[PDB]
Design a binder for these strands. Structure first.
Ligand SMILES: O=C(N[C@H](CO)[C@H](O)c1ccc([N+](=O)[O-])cc1)C(Cl)Cl
Ligand SMILES: [K+]
Ligand SMILES: [K+]
Ligand SMILES: [K+]
Ligand SMILES: [K+]
Ligand SMILES: [K+]
Ligand SMILES: [K+]
Ligand SMILES: [K+]
Ligand SMILES: [Mg+2]
Ligand SMILES: [Mg+2]
Ligand SMILES: [Mg+2]
Ligand SMILES: [Mg+2]
Ligand SMILES: [Mg+2]
Ligand SMILES: [Mg+2]
Ligand SMILES: [Mg+2]
Ligand SMILES: [Mg+2]
Ligand SMILES: [Mg+2]
Ligand SMILES: [Mg+2]
Ligand SMILES: [Mg+2]
Ligand SMILES: [Mg+2]
Ligand SMILES: [Mg+2]
Ligand SMILES: [Mg+2]
Ligand SMILES: [Mg+2]
Ligand SMILES: [Mg+2]
Ligand SMILES: [Zn+2]
Lengths: 175, 37, 143, 207
RNA sequence: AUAAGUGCUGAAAGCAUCUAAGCAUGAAGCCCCCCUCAAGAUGAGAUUUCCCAUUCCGCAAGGAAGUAAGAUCCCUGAAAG
RNA sequence: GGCACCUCGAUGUCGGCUCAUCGCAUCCUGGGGCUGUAGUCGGUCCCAAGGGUUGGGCUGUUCGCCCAUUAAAGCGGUACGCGAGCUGGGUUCAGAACGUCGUGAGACAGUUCGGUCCCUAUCCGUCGCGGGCGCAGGAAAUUUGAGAGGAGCUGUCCUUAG
RNA sequence: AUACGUUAAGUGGAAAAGGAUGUGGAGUUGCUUAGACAA
């Protein structure tokens, strides 16, 4: 596992605490993330460098080693820099608006679609055609962004819908 | 989705994968999406 | 000359078995034998020589493989199209006592005496049982 | 949940304000009494036991008299439980009157349906007759008992037997009027049972 | 709670990948919700209330006899048959 | 169709009627992928058996064609389900006739008109309804719900919006 | 039961052409710290 073997530098502003049963808590300026890992993995912290060690070269271990390493890296990056996903509303009359904590989507349905973010996730609407999902947990930022995109996934005849920023929507010619 | 006994690359961009103990082809071309069945 | 146990001679102990982390079938086969009295040298086929068994932590019984999802408990109501089904996961969550009872019942003799032997089984979801009065000993499974 | 026990008096009709003619069932429900409060601690579930219709002392027994003693009421002919009610609202001995309901409120009405005695498959199960002519000797019989292969009749082959006398709930009936003076509910439409039979009127479960 | 399907994060396999660990979503279908029966559920459950510890043999075991609360026979009937 | 293994001291045979029940290779409705999917429609494949799945004309018919509907007018199994449940139009006794073949008696998966469908339910099974005992005293009520059954279909219009 | 392996499919405990980075054991061979392969 090239990925697993890679060493993780912890920024000065992030504290990683290893608790019982391979539960790692990572604290930084943007918040705290706690996660339990598989017992077999050996997570060491030495001189601000996090290292992950696999007990054997068994299929499961080689896979787990890379995953554990990647998740810990995402936790450290998440509490320091955070994760942000950007969505672009493409369509005539398609608009996003923030109502308190709720995202309100007007995407050509007979009713507005409201999305309530989970705890630890902020939704920003910098423009009526742009939505930014921000948070510490990469998985959660991704899940919510997918939830938003699902309201009206991009269609191919005119690319209308909610897309990821920079998403190459496959296009078919109509008439 | 093509559900067929013979799942194979149709083009060069097709990629054979395994999900839930089922052989599949994923591709950027959606016509080439295949699942063994 | 071969001695035969009878209702006068037989003396039944109470045993507690903890089901926590035990494989359903492996626990069941040992309990079934205890209920039958196969562990007693006075074992007699035509009478119930076995011991009473309390099972606690029945919800914490384990199944190997994908049996939680894929092991199906069928029953038929005797009405047309009356086959009902529950998964092992559904059984363990909602009907853990029935799950153990079903496992053990299938391993006991069939007939009047086998049905009588099953009456000495008592299965419980959690850690506690109400048979303090019967003064039950802990029984570790041999395995 | 709200509820009350009454007797079915009969049917009549009422002109609404807009001039529509509504068929109504009249239910006379003299004040019900809470005889007992069942609790999750004692009984394993929450319910109130309503007593209705004062019985003569001769027709009562010592078990009955002792049971109604806490409520401080005469022995009751009809006793039924309501579940899903607010336990703190009720107390033993409290009267439950028809004015718990109001006009416009949607109710479910439970009663025992009228007895029809032993009835054939045509009446009981709504089955079709065979032909009345064209050589037919098959009029009101219940049809084939089933296929050959099982060597037996399946359960649920519907046959003649005792019809009616079954508990029936009719859902989503409207209260037209509540006569608190005469202890009457006027309910729109028809409800199960003979005149004088016990009717339970409850707030609608689907509302 | 799921099916097909759609995913998120994610390595095995520096990438990619809905899957291996982990986390979602998703059918008139499944389990409930709604209606009815139901403790012979011999695993015979629960709650409230009532009666109250009688007289005889028989060494006791047990049996017999009057009864209590309560119910029935019989009778008037129908909303039941 | 092949075979000739059960039944010739009899296992009634087509179609309809009555009553269904099961499979899913799904006709409709529900959820989807791909589309040579602009939309409205469709095509194709995947999941799905919960419920639903028409009245007529002709013919003994099944089938089929046709008329008019329908969301749809599914395909199969159950002794080509069901005659001790019904029918008996057809097939398949005795009468008669036509064509045809035969010297003839007669014969014909050729046709035609007419032609007896028995049974008081013992057992299991099915649907109802009682009696008994049980349930560690005897009673009167109210009940929990293991478990079981039922229900489960769908159109059109208006609005969103020309 | 013992010992050493294999299988993750309840395969075991029905079914073929064909399809497939399933996984175990052998062997051949190209390229590679004169820096491969991935990015
Ligand atoms: O011959 C009869 N039936 C026999 C059994 O004895 C059998 O069931 C059968 C029925 C029909 C058939 N046919 O149509 O060719 C042949 C035999 C009597 Cl029911 Cl008449
Ligand atoms: K009982
Ligand atoms: K024969
Ligand atoms: K169906
Ligand atoms: K007949
Ligand atoms: K017969
Ligand atoms: K029999
Ligand atoms: K198997
Ligand atoms: Mg091919
Ligand atoms: Mg008719
Ligand atoms: Mg007649
Ligand atoms: Mg049989
Ligand atoms: Mg009881
Ligand atoms: Mg054949
Ligand atoms: Mg031969
Ligand atoms: Mg014979
Ligand atoms: Mg299918
Ligand atoms: Mg037939
Ligand atoms: Mg028959
Ligand atoms: Mg001639
Ligand atoms: Mg002939
Ligand atoms: Mg139940
Ligand atoms: Mg039963
Ligand atoms: Mg098998
Ligand atoms: Zn391709």
């Amino acid at each position: 596992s090239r990925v697993g073997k890679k060493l993780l530098e912890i920024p000065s502003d992030v504290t990683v605490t290893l608790n019982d049963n391979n539960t790692v808590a990572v604290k930084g300026p943007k918040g705290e993330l706690t996660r339990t890992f598989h017992p077999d993995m050996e997570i060491k912290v030495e001189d601000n460098v996090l290292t992950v060690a696999r007990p054997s070269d068994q299929k499961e271990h080689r896979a787990l080693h890379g995953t554990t390493r990647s998740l810990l890296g995402n936790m450290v990056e998440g509490v320091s820099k955070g994760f942000e996903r950007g969505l672009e509303l493409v369509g005539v009359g398609y608009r996003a608006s923030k109502s308190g904590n709720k995202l309100v989507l007007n995407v050509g349905y007979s009713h507005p679609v409201e999305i309530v973010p989970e705890e630890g996730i902020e939704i920003e609407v910098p423009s009526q055609t742009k939505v930014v999902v921000k948070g510490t947990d990469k998985e959660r930022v991704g899940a919510i962004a997918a939830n938003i995109r699902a309201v009206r996934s991009p269609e191919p005849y005119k690319g209308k819908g909610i897309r990821y920023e920079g998403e190459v929507v496959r296009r078919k010619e109509g008439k | 989705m093509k559900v067929r006994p013979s799942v194979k690359p149709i083009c060069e961009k097709c990629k054979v994968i395994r999900r839930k103990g089922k052989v599949m082809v994923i591709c950027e071309n959606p016509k080439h999406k295949q699942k063994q069945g | 000359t071969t001695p035969m146990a009878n209702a006068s001679t037989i003396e039944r102990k109470w045993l507690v078995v903890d089901a926590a982390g035990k494989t359903l079938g492996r626990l069941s086969s040992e309990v079934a034998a205890i209920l039958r009295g196969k562990h007693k040298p006075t074992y007699t086929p035509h009478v119930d020589t076995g011991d009473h068994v309390i099972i606690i932590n029945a919800e914490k019984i384990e199944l190997t493989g994908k049996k939680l999802t894929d092991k199906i408990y069928y029953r038929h109501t005797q009405h047309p199209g009356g086959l009902k089904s529950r998964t092992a996961l559904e059984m363990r969550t909602n009907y853990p006592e029935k799950m153990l009872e079903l496992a053990i019942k299938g391993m006991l003799p069939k007939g009047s005496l086998g049905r009588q032997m099953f009456k000495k089984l008592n299965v419980y979801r959690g850690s506690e049982h109400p048979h303090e009065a019967q003064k039950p000993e802990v029984y570790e499974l041999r395995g | 949940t709200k509820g009350i026990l009454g007797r079915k008096i009969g049917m009549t009709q009422v002109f609404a304000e807009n001039g529509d003619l509504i068929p109504v069932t009249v239910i006379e429900a003299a004040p019900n009494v809470v005889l007992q409060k069942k609790t999750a601690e004692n009984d394993g579930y929450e319910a109130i036991q309503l007593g209705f219709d004062d019985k003569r002392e001769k027709l009562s027994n010592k078990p009955e008299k002792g049971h109604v003693a806490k409520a401080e009421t005469a022995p009751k002919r009809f006793v039924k439980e309501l579940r899903g009610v607010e336990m703190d609202a009720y107390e033993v001995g409290q009267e439950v009157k028809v004015e718990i309901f109001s006009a416009g409120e949607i109710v479910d009405v439970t009663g025992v349906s009228k007895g029809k005695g032993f009835q054939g498959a045509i009446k009981r199960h709504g089955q079709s007759r065979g032909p009345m002519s064209h050589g037919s000797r098959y009029h009101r019989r219940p049809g084939s008992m089933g296929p050959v292969d099982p060597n037996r009749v399946f359960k649920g082959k519907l046959l003649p037997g005792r019809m009616g006398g079954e508990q029936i709930t009719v859902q989503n009936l409207e209260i037209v009027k509540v006569d608190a003076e005469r202890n009457l509910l006027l309910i729109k439409g028809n409800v199960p049972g003979a005149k004088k039979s016990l009717i339970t009127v409850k707030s609608a479960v689907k509302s």
